[PDB]
């Protein structure tokens, strides 16, 4: 999932 991108680790 997108948690591996900092720009999607806010609320992932």
Residue 8 corresponds to which tokens in the numbers above? 């999607």
Residue count of the chain, please give it: 12
CB 2 within 8 A of CB 12: yes
Instruction: Give the C-alpha distances (Å, rounded to integers) separating 6 from 1, 12.
Output: 12, 9
Residue 3 corresponds to which tokens in the numbers above? 């948690």
CA Rg, the chain, in Å?
A: 5
What is 1-12 written as a DSSP string?
-GGGSGGGTTT-
């Amino acid at each position: 999932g997108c948690c591996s991108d900092p720009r999607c680790a806010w609320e992932c």
